[model samples]
Target chain A: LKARGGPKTLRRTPGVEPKDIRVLPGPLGSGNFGTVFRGVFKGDQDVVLKNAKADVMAAEELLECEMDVNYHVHANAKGTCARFMGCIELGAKDGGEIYNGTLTEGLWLMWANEGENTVEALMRRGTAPLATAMACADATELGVTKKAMRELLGSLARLHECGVVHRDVKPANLIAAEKDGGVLKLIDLGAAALCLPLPETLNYYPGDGPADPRYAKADELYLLPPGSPRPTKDNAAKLWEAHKPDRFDSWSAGCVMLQLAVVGLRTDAGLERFLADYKAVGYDVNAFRGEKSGEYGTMDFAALDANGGAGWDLCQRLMEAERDARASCEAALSHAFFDAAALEHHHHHH
Target chain B: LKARGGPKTLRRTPGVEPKDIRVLPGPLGSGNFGTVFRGVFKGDQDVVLKNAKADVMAAEELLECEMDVNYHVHANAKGTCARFMGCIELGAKDGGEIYNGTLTEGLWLMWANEGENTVEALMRRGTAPLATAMACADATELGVTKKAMRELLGSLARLHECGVVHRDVKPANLIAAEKDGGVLKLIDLGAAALCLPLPETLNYYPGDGPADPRYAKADELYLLPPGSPRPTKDNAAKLWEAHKPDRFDSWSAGCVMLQLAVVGLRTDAGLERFLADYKAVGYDVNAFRGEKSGEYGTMDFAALDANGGAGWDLCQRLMEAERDARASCEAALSHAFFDAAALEHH
Candidate 1:
């Protein structure tokens, strides 16, 4: 009945076709991983096609990592998470913006790209980009922009409500379909990982190696388990590791929403500062002992410092040094730093 | 007698010994920039020597930029601004890191290189960095951290207090010295132009540039404005365009604190997420452009959306699209994002 699977990689190709899918342009019209070609079903439905670069596609490990964590985000993203429309890994003779691999037999995954007609609008025209305009002008108004931000927040809360961690949340990743005006839909699931990457190795490799050996080495050292048994052929394979194939769609939806909000189409100055700061805090002196590539900023102590209170003085008194303080993603979200922005979203009327 | 008083790069031979000036290290540690070698005089020590490549001696532009901005930041800082320390330009041939002249003095201004000891702290376990052990931890206990955060807000208030903006602020820039534990000194006055660089080249120069071209460009763009110029040789030379240097420090300081609170040290994950989030909400986003040098972040937006009526939502709002909608940095520091962690001090 079923033709012999063309190849190992093609064992499970997504059923959705690119033509059947409708590509919708989102707020973050384009993104780092890929452009958002919002998809849809043959019946002319609504959805988003996250056309990630081939390199990102090649990052099966990253794709899978996003899959696992985003699942949790999906469960929690009530009213927020986009409906899981399934993946549609496009095929090619070779070459991708990121992922580099040839499809000997078939494509990896593909899904119904939907939500094709959302228009990009600068709702809060006076605010954000036009700082001087808003300031110099006598008067400016905030209308749907306020609603957009509220809807954005509402979706985020839903994700947090469920034990899901949307690691990458920002403005561009959010979308407000034409059908659902005032209702912002969070999309893009590229940067969403379960826990920070272990080695941050081949699977979820963030970027090039650190030019500074110290940073690169620190990242590598974290990957090695202290005292763990090696995986045997039979025991290594667990049922959970088995591909259900069906749940992949759920994971894709969660990621799409996240990408829409956290990282939009274009680069802004605010984002650069945030990244530089992140790099500054990701490593320690000893952390970068020996590394293959001497890049910059490859370690993350948040797991130890912020999460476990290893560096947090208040929690140490309340807990042990070695034990993880166990700051859940949801709990961390509740911290003041994450919460300190303008609550009232005022926008221009026109 | 002076050989020539007008403009055109001037050089002095037989310089004064830096040691003679009593170069004591500032409370803040050193890093890629070099050391903040503080000098003490019998009474009036008006200059600061950012001795670059302590092993070697040379004049650098980074120091110049920092120095230039200091004038403005000092005026704005009033009390908070670090006193204008003279730029002790030493010959590079002496004991210091190698000074490659062309690369050092190319078209771009070559900044001074301080030692690593001042900024790069080796905080090993049990060994307290700068002796402020447990104090940072107890910020929550004694509410000192909160006080410190308020102080940071106060400091930022002082910056904005003077209509100055420090665009590049983070932890590495915030220094703590044994002399002043409660007092955290801000270092690296990178992006403090009186008027921010033109949007085209604010963060960096455009197209076919270095990966980190953005941050460096922003630093260079900060210069004083001389206004309409007179064509006289000496007068015009004396009045090259100057930007508010010190005020830029304050603006950069704000960025520094924002950095420290979110991520302790700089890392790829930290950089990627911060920039992406910053970009998403119409903040800083250059760092997240997926450059070969940048760390690709997996931090998408779903969970970060803050759909709930929570602190994250507030942060998005405060760091809004419109400047008017945005809260003051002081107000932002008071928001939920800096809540529990906001109070702790170094």
Candidate 2:
């Protein structure tokens, strides 16, 4: 068979031994496609590795999609986001092979800590699932909620400007390093999409209407779904085709913002109205007032500054109920949602 | 005399100019050291340039210090943070020129924004001070605070490990940049001290109890002592030496955190208490907990996870109130806090 390095190639390489490369594992939890395992690279440091079979049609497509997105993600992401280590493709030569159609894929990520020890550590004093992290109380626990929210949106604006969309944007994906100097890193690009145009994919219907909420939440769909983790090349393409417009990325980011504001997820009346209002006026308001106009989107930060209503405007756009009306990942990145002063960097000069 | 090429010689030779340059007047009500000016590079993007005359020892020192620190800060900063361009010391071609030091001695910086426009834009958002930027709260308004704070602290932990103390950490030194993936960047390090042995800089009277309250608030020194900015380099150094440990950096970050908790800095007991805790503890406890014991430094966190307790122990040791009792920046860096993360690539 073509020298054996196909899509499911998980054979150990020459540099690092498999024994030395034990994948870090986390307590299991349900995710988009199935339960996810938290693993590590080198030491006890955390890295999440998603396990899936490669031979099945749907599973194979999802794995490939994750890998493809990660390839570019690792390219542009430096500080304030997790670095994507290579995804391992298991082959028959590896012996511990799963299915055959190239369905299984594991996403190896650098853990974005929740700051040296979160208030969670202070609250739980180090417990269990409660240990995941004590959620941040909005606006009150920290007074400048709006400011933090603006900074985040600004970063999102920068990300979009760089042409990457975190389709699965949310608090879980957005984590702070548990260290000092306040480093924040965005993670979980398994569902992230690049700057490519979308067509013939899952269309987003405003959430309030009677639509399939199952497909609306990209991460939920990606992790919670069940079946074979393997997929054929054709199935991979089909899955991609089924996930076009990539609005799920935008919707997911919005969901993350909501989660941050209100600790838990509850589809109540106030939230529902909030979501609907967001959907109705989000894009039109454009974070900086006149940020966009007509059918084509144009970015003018000058107008944004004069407008004085961009941060909330973008939040509304991202958190809206109608999927189509929400700003795209590209749109969010273009806004001044993130700050460059707070990013982290390291250079290994030989 | 140093060679007259760029500003000052940095570790790296500096990269291709994003453009050619020009300097213009700064905004009204600012520009104290006769150095604030608008800069244009390659006729593309407009940036602000802050100058320090090589002849003025204090001004000269501050410029060099600020430039060096900004470089490292930007290097480790996140996307929403400011982008650090290169700094070149401007010297005179003729010995009789107006300024005595060469361009190689005096320093100038390249920034992403220009005019009252950029300043007003940020000020309108209430980030006029670096204090607001570092406080984790501003990130929410900027939409990248949580992520940015995590990244900044991780970088800070790394810097502290390397013995770099951002002595003059403040809000003016921080900027919200739209570069990279969008994050905040720490800036201006003219007052930073790198790899220096912990100086028993603070002279204290045992009776000047912790609660006596000299400059108790976080970034209190930055408030201009009623109007003027805190005394420049030597004066600040002397003041710090005469009284407290050089707790400015820790207190500065604490100040940001405090600002985050209390929207404005006019007054707040909790803000004062939070800043005071860091002073009492003596180091950036929140930032270094992971490197110390693989946990966080907080009362509640200590009670839950066993590892969390270990973290507190480490924090208690580093933040020891007695200057001599505290671990050297070097020792702390070498502890579990630094080498704990064994990433293959790093």
Candidate 3:
């Protein structure tokens, strides 16, 4: 176990005490797998302590998968990924147990932020949710929007450079930094999967079954299908036997882009309506353009038209329903959508 | 000279060779005072070499004032001010001569940037100049714009803290960083002046007469009335001594805010049209609202209203006609105009 520390090992080292970690009053956020608490170490530095329930801890494979992905991404994409502090395992002799009963695995991470802010929350404000819509309004706003999109896509490129794909790429998962010029972090690696060519044990095509259906790619829906019985772990392993993991994320990112462009497809019903409208057009940009009624799903085109087709071209490329044809994150970053102005630096040596 | 090395002294020391400084092709920029060249030192390190023209160099008092402000700001405001590289006094015995004739006082500064991309240029790209307007359209965009504004204002605050006021604060003077998260630099300190308690040697008020007229505050215009004879050095000094340097910058920054809010306003005519419409209503937001024809300057409110009256409130506060009434940079930063979302780090 010590030898397997891809970056740093998780050992029963001293100072892994509950007393050392003073959990703040409220939890930062929680998921089905675990609850994360805003914590402090030695009463100074901010950290996050994720308490994995007994089930997650007991599922050795799940725990290993999470740990492995976290380590691998951090190892490969240093500044891009969250800085991993160290992990603590309960019931170990040297590492003082934080919880004795069912709850076991405890991971200590450098606190990513002290705020509940995300890109989604910010974009969702105002009566019309015009954040994304107005972004495409004029040149200066468009430049800013495109620059942001570049950064987001750049982050994905960084992740893909490593052997991992952030299967879930949505505003909610992208946590905003509390300071200016900070990189927006992609969180919730619970559903993250390895790139194509699956390991023998998990043989089936690793599916997008775990992805948020609203933001899932068309291929994700086609392959998994709705209302079908859940594929058994063995069946899932077999599914990937013929298929290689491709850029399903690019397509998912497209859906996220569209959602951002229109603002607020937060509900399942809202997304379902959009998906139906999208499919009705036979997955074609021209088809969506052909609808002379001046409407696209719940999106108000009149509002978008204010910018006089500001982001239509980039949106067309991003939201290409076919996963194979969709622009890759790398290609998207280099697209002419972003201003060609070369970035400049200001450095003064004291 | 050694004692005055606020950060580093201007020495007539060795290594001031022309061979040491390789002038790069294409001038970065030029002002009436000096022409800046993007150059490299020792053929590796990036630097900006400013050559004060013969006249500027000849005016010993003016040259001294520029150097004193540059060094003092760098020394006191450290991180906020641009780093000052040592100046080169040519034809001196100990200081190696770089150029033998004509231009003499060569000022070396840390390179600010390679591109001419200013905040104005970046924000004026689209037809509507909707940088700030669009930012107010949504929460996320608002956050980004507000954060940018905060950084710019914070830079100003830091300057004010150093007892200096950037009398000419506008989009052209503020250079945007190549990277998204970098701070927008406050450049061109040639027009900068001290606040209150006039300096005896510099009798003139160092007026904003040199500033772009469109962004000149009401106070600036009133002090140095348009078409009025430029104040003689002594008269200008008396004017400042009587009035004391006030927050004229707040009003100038308001014009910049209006420019950013709408995007354009690049030309005098464009600014004139807006100012005319603005002044027509007696500079009153309510009065403007009462106008049967809806328009603010060259801006179309039909579009601004779409964002649900987004940046109007803040812009109104900033563009207050009176200098005393206009919002200070610090106060403007805290305005609800910016999404109160804690500027989540991103």
Candidate 4:
């Protein structure tokens, strides 16, 4: 019920010279509009600015939908995200920036702090969430954890083949970059989207608003079905304006490889009694995968089909709750659980 | 009492590539030995790392006195301070760094977020401390506020002609690179010192230790005169190895221009009722400035000698209480209260 538009002047995209950028004084995050920090522009580049609020960049269509999803994933996604780098407005009269020497105003941006590994630090295998030491470190590297879970479903099948939708695929928005042959990237495009939105935008989907309900799915816990058009809020924005932003990015990358294959599946709790027996005997994951379906409850799915191998049958056909029975990042990258981890990464590269 | 030393491997000072420096999360301050963050090196040089504490850099003489006063104020206080750009040790199999991908061990350093103005924002003409709008904006900019208080007493008379003793001169360690031609600079050497001393150093002074009792003085709130050869504490380190580190950096730049001329002379509280009437009728700022000297109370020094013009007689001869009657940054830069703001800054 609240998603309109009002702020406008965004365009500028140059580099440094907001008096050779600085900010630095500590503030890595803040909210209700913006704050983040750790800036530096003309001395060496470890960016991450953000900034915003001056009445939310004085409503320039909410600062051009937060600088057009980070300049459309840094100018058309192509290499699959993170590296926007271009902003610094401060008090406008077109340009006379010099922040803390005063004469200031707002809209910062910048970003980039790319990687050092995170899929929430490989699902807390370290920061102690001891789900039996994450099932004995996912049983001694089950083929390098299914080749980093088939490069997180081939980087969401190359951002849904670049029509882009990364509407926030969790586990701290993936990452990896380099720590020996891992390369994976995708990072916070501050809630990205756009498989074509623009009937004054606000397309809503990837676990619709206030997300992280254990990576949302049983049809994004229902609400938007009433006048099913766009600017939605409950019924997961009309099940994301009725499906196909690559099936809400393959059901949030199959709830991030089913919580990297069952280590405290949904941090151990019955998930609203399996989402009220998935809305009363819903789409039959073999009638609640492994028993107890009567008043709709108890699911274990052979511990997510033996810690997701045969990638738990393409993570239950990409967590299917009937969006034409899910699975497609080109049929979960030709399943058979990435055929013996792509022949054990071609026999450990010969 | 606890000023000892031991751990050693320091000297590094080059520049970025502590795995392309990132540590940028938050924390700009922390203490019981270290923390201060806001880093980012090969991503555009706005640093300030610090870190320390791993059993205080495992005592290599207290991590070479916190990496030798920020590499001796970045190799001998040249531009008179804050630039120290060097440090990052994490797990030294000697040069295989990666940081957050693990292989870490601490002690960070790096620094240089050098200035965006602060002498507490030029004595609060801005961030609202109100003292009657800082005495009506220091009465119509008394000579551009004594030409930025004679460029903060000629940048502490050229950091005490280089022997170094910026023992923390306040108003947030003075700064002002350019918010109008003022140019002043000196900044946090994390409590700097060293006017010689190093036959295995410890040299004390500059409010010597448990500091910030509203920037100490009247003989650092009195006590040391008994067997004072050195290493003293609650008697502020033998009144800082008995004075002359440029009279404790000209009594902290005359208590930062007498709080830029009396805007709450050290935030109102009768500074221990004028340090017990300067330990009973002593070196008189006219016996405690404005009146009441008997039960040793009521003193104001006529509203800091009428808003310090003739810079309140060189800020009561550098807030004197007799450290041989103070006044040094080269006699507070040849006073007549910085003669026509040091000839409109020469």
Candidate 5:
């Protein structure tokens, strides 16, 4: 070994020291990747501390990708991405205790709070989760919802500016910073990946469909019709090439917007009517993308037009099944759908 | 009268229109200057629209100084000052009604919502005014109070950065933008003035002191102690010269800080105790400035010391009676009182 270290570098910011941490209650919620806990750093700043374990060798290196991506994206995006307060390594002794016996074998990651006192002082108060707010939205809340969508798109635009694609874009991954101008900050960067255009080493694309069922983008091959004649080896190789991963998020965002825009899908009774339409079309889910062009992924265009043709026009463009047809986040933001004039008109008509 | 024409200039933004005007409820509050009414611009944005009259020859020109200063300062300061959405002039018909019948001959000024729905859909239900919040504060609210002071200083620093001084820096002039991260924004630019280093055109200095009663800065000559060897004409002229107007705001900001930092000054009962201390010092009010160094403006230094002394050091510096001794808003923000490590320590 010529040298053990490559270069010395200064840390962007300080990580949480074990001495200052007081893990509040238990984990906020945990998934396959890690367990998250509401923590108070130095008694004043409330933070979300996450613990992830990998029993394999070089597990710390595996965690490094997410830690690095979070810091870089947040450093670049003005206030869109959640600020990444560095991560801490867990030891056999009290790191396990601070982690609430989650995983002593691995390490804990931390982020500056986008939601304060969430989950009831770790459970309830500060601001509603985007998923909860979206679920509870009504037609009267459309003005507020329009702002939410605009802010979300603006936030997504900043992330894309950093060449990063949040592979997971869902209401659950977003939090309304009520204290911070009611703007939404996208959280949970575990599935976020960088989009690099290259002929090889293209591993950022997540071939799997997104977390939500309504995403019906052409990026996935699972829904590839069986009767369709497959392309040749050369064409198949091109097909297997890295797809536009950012569009995956746009498709997911469009699905969320449809629920906000279309009143028919907004209620239990309304959703039931659409469920019948989609089920009758020989699909178990409500993926907007259909097999043919005329249907254009089963979007209720007439229903969308009822709100104001501008918003309907936007939802249809983002949900376009064809990858080429789908509008990028930047392109979507520029649409007349977000015009204050249109929103002002809608307010009067309502 | 050479050409009777002026150079054309581009407008920074558009002013409000008549058709979009829908005055909500009644006026929020009015004072000697103008009446402020809550109005919805284009039906989506909530704006605080104020109508002021100037029946004099150049009343609009006098208003122009404030309007121009608000736009310029807000343009320079990054989100610290309330954004100056353009102003509109009221006309014959419904301009009076849209203004809630304040003064039809006057004009209307607008600002982007710094405190959304602040007057209850017209009366209340958004962030509390800084004065209200300051009065209700207790010992438990110290952490929040520290942030309020830091943000206030930071905002003042930005205003100073633009070479502007808010002549009025009282609790009522600030609004807590709860929707925007609990940061306090300095508003009501009607009395703000530009700071210039010159012998002439130094009218920005307000010899009227400030709106609040607690101001004790050396800038004012009204409090010139009786029986003292009065300064000669030269000395008095120097005294009357444009004093450090920015320090006026700093003194007011420090006075506000003391109420927030000291638990004793926090409650109604605690204020009673300090009121007696100042009265014995031969002052009719709680103007912290004192006659001697030993008292150092009667700042309740001992009580301030009880709260870890870091905050006391800051309050003491900002409240210094001597003009040169007072800390500037920029200087105040850098004090150890605001440091995270010290705040974390204190």
Candidate 6:
């Protein structure tokens, strides 16, 4: 079923003229529906703009969803999400106001130029994106991962509280803004769900369709397990509770911890080597069920549990395969890992 | 190591003018390198043009290799490959000639606009590229898949004999011409290796780095297993022989066969359902080594062997994990699957 009303129902906003922004010649990157580019807004203001494909109505739905989620999060959890700026529609304007439907050149979504470093760039040298291996060489550098994870969880927890699910929670989306220094704002919420229990027709859940397949939870990929309504009405809620869209982040966060754990194991080695070795160590999976991991990942899970201590314990709890069993970010934050992160002035050791 | 001589060493050919080729807006699709766009060649020819990203030097190598392979295949496998119509570099020109290494805007590669339909379109119904539930309602449609697979194998065999490995051998790259009708041509040789034993620096193998990951072989993803080069020299030869770069296509071809078998099995369902059921039926991989298929693919491999008969037998033989065990295209062509494909005519 098409999202017939999704784009059409979105309210229009005040728009800017095409001359107000100049998208550079080359594209930064593109997805199925849109291309992101660096551009100059209002003469001197450097901004990033997402230019959408005009013909695809799905492009309009994506733009609308991104705008709705972003504006709410920015208003509520200002520091937790990326900085939200206004949008520019190509056609349909009444006194600088943008309109929906009957647009020729599509739309432009703007963001303040920030992103000094990404979680990927900071941890894995610089965006090879081949594998993610975080360095926990010492208590000091260990604290860097600890601090980032805490901040990421804190942002994620805030989103859940705001009835938002940052559906895509992988490394690259974690960006350290130029202004905030070590602070990371969860960016790129194009795949987010504004609130929980989206109508089945509207909800594109299951996989969240991550950028990297490794980080994806298996249940996300498979068909929604066979069940019926009636006795399955609670069963539907039961399935939703099992997946609990927000808990999806907990698994990804544990994966982030797993990457950090690999750094602790071998102070040196690229992500590929670490993952092969990690798979080699054969971490204790005596308790987990369904959907076994395949031949990849970058952590010494066996040693991670032993060496990771309380932080490691929380990592497992978050990683519990069954959704309800996975630790909520709010509860898991209290584990000594946060205190450990606070106590270590690792960066000061320099 | 960076390919120092790879792109630079290639000799320049007379190039068409930028004005002669106007690339229309809206890209056909993008890849790791750059975008391909529809274009007009000379005055009226509808040509497909590839515009490389001048930013990444690897983009240069893609066009360079694509040209080398496309031109060769276009000439030799003339009917079995897309037509090659020279190139367009941004700023380099000498008395109506194009020079090498002058990066202006990026290079533009042109091909005669042919692909009336692709193997993906023919089997799976257009380029929605879903799970190819081939329309094998009967022996007639089954003949289409048989004929298409045979032609693809013949083209591939020709390339391997030419010492070329069409590294990217997925559904999308194989095209059929407007004029040739049912004739399917192997297109998109951008990732093809010119000759064997790609230097440690040169080859990006294993996965053939496929457009789709499910088709990737496991050995391609793992590290080149550990060893000292002295023993690893013969060891290197041993390993190369084990993988036998060309045999990489064998695994992919089996994947295509697997898709066909699935179409035969249920005769209904989209790609997603077929794959889930394929994994559900659980293909017999008793003798295969190194790899294990994930929870996807469309075939009911269990029934495929029984239902597919001779074709399924060759599918397993081609899909043999170890290089030596896998059937080369030449030998496998003799398999009864080829004859079975022949004996049936609608």
Which candidate has the top score in DockQ? Answer: 6
Off by over 4 Å in 1: A1-350, B1-48, B51-62, B75-83, B89-148, B195-266, B277-314, B321-324, B333-346
Instruction: Residues A216-297, candidate 6: write the lDDT tens digits.
Output: 4544432232342321322545544554667777776776666654453222123324334334444324322112233334
Q: Which candidate achieves the best lDDT against the true structure?
A: 6
Using lDDT as the measure, name the better of candidate 4 and candidate 6.
Answer: 6
Q: By DockQ, is 4 or 6 better?
A: 6
Cand 4, B chain, TM: 0.33
Task: Encode model 3's per-residue lDDT on A1-350: one tens digit a residue.
Answer: 11221333454435555556665644454443455666677767776666543322223344455666776667677544445565655432233333321223244444344335566665555323333332332333333355457667887788766546666677677654544343456776655665433232221132334445556654563333343334454454443332313355666666655555554354334455566666777766556667622444545443223244645556667677655566767878776556443442334423
Model 5 clashing-pair count: 16
- Model 6 chain B poorest ten-residue lDDT run: B94-103
Q: Weakest 10 consecutive residues, lDDT, candidate 1 chain A?
A: A209-218
The recovered share of true contacts, given per candidate in order, is 0.00, 0.00, 0.00, 0.00, 0.00, 0.00
- Model 1 C-alpha lDDT per residue in residues B307-342, reported as the tens digit of each score: 242333433443343344445655656566445444
RMSD of each: 30.4, 26.8, 28.8, 23.7, 26.9, 18.6
Model-by-model DockQ, in order? 0.01, 0.01, 0.00, 0.01, 0.01, 0.02
Chain A accuracy of model 4 expressed as TM-score? 0.33
TM, chain A, every candidate: 0.42, 0.52, 0.70, 0.33, 0.68, 0.70
Report the lDDT tens digits of candidate 3 across residue range B120-171: 6666454233333223333232333554566666777776655566666776
Docking class of 5: incorrect
Query: What is candidate 6's local distance difference test score?
Result: 0.55
> What DockQ does candidate 2 have relative to the true complex?
0.01
Which has the better lDDT: candidate 2, or candidate 6? 6
